[PDB]
Point group: C3
Chain length 125, copies 3
């Protein structure tokens, strides 16, 4: 069906899941203990691969929590409906102090955003 | 109805409003005079609480103006349809020079983005 | 029709185009050789002007490539359906080392994201 098809590639991996009735995203957790460097970025591995529903891509959005408290932001984050590989979550540390991530930690959130994918019309001949 | 239900929690607060026919967002103003630190972040208070329409969350997006001119970016920014609290706008100063915000200043913009919230289908048994 | 109407304003300009069947965005290329400064931002010119389809705005999203490899992020990025001017792509260099951009380089990607633009309902009288 056209829901969020998820495929774990490591048992450690968690199934994305929304935290509330009105929640906009499905939590995305870390599958490795990593350190996102001060003023630096890192590529955390989710351990899963997903197929967003049709006519809608998946945007890795930042979590209110880590943003406010640790100045953690999310770089890139555009997952195409044709992406068969593993979801990588690229975080950027806005702080002068390192951030610690442990297997299991919800490090971001997926949001199936509806988009229109029409053809291009070039004007000016 | 399913429009943008807004609830001011301080008279100082401004009603979000789109700046043009084709505008994608409703302006979100500051309700306090604050300073967003160089290479730092701050949590500006909007003074309002909103309920995005159904099947669509609210994304606090950055303003072309402040982005270009002061290197002001917007962290976090995901407001769930079930959020009953006050909207906080988390800004991050990309500059080596402080930025000044005064009650009333449009500091960001809300965008009711349509999303699909289906269930999760786990493959691999 | 309601597709992506594109208008080149310099022959150098490239027509936005999706890189795959499931791709979520249309590549947006640079039309000038520019340098986005370490820990700095710049406004790259696309040389084109577009009209996103109706009931959907255009979001300049970052490319997985440049994000991971050079720590390149995209500031602002909200293009309203009523924008008649030229698309400017504002990039922010997260790195301590400069980044080089050359006419033609795909520097970002446009994503026609569906949004709802209803009226505002103010509660509390
Ligand atoms: O934060 C991100 C952003 C993207 N992707 C995946 C989803 C998408 O399907 C693929 C895109 O890589 P690319 O588009 O082929 O390279 P580029 O963006 O330079 O065109 O990378 C991630 O795993 N994490
Ligand atoms: O910039 C933001 C981002 C989110 N929120 C609100 C909207 C949402 O309903 C709530 C989410 O907090 P949380 O999701 O419960 O904490 P976490 O993101 O770590 O799960 O915070 C804001 O006010 N400002
Ligand atoms: O990265 C961006 C972001 C926006 N715009 C364009 C699209 C939009 O139509 C216009 C908006 O400028 P503005 O909204 O009138 O100034 P402000 O955001 O302070 O209201 O700028 C760009 O070209 N590049
Ligand atoms: Mg940033």
């Amino acid at each position: 069906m056209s829901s969020l098809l998820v495929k774990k590639l490591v048992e450690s991996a968690t199934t994305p899941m929304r935290g509330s009735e009105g929640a906009a995203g499905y939590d995305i957790s870390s599958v490795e203990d990593v350190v996102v460097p001060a003023m630096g970025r890192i590529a955390v591995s989710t351990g899963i691969s997903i197929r967003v529903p049709d006519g809608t891509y998946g945007r890795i959005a930042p979590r209110s929590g880590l943003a406010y408290k640790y100045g953690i932001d999310v770089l890139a984050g555009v997952i195409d409906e044709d992406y068969t590989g593993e979801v990588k979550v690229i975080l950027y540390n806005t702080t002068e102090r390192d951030y610690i991530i442990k297997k299991g930690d919800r490090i971001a959130q997926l949001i199936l955003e509806q988009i229109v994918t029409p053809g291009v019309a070039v004007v000016l001949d």
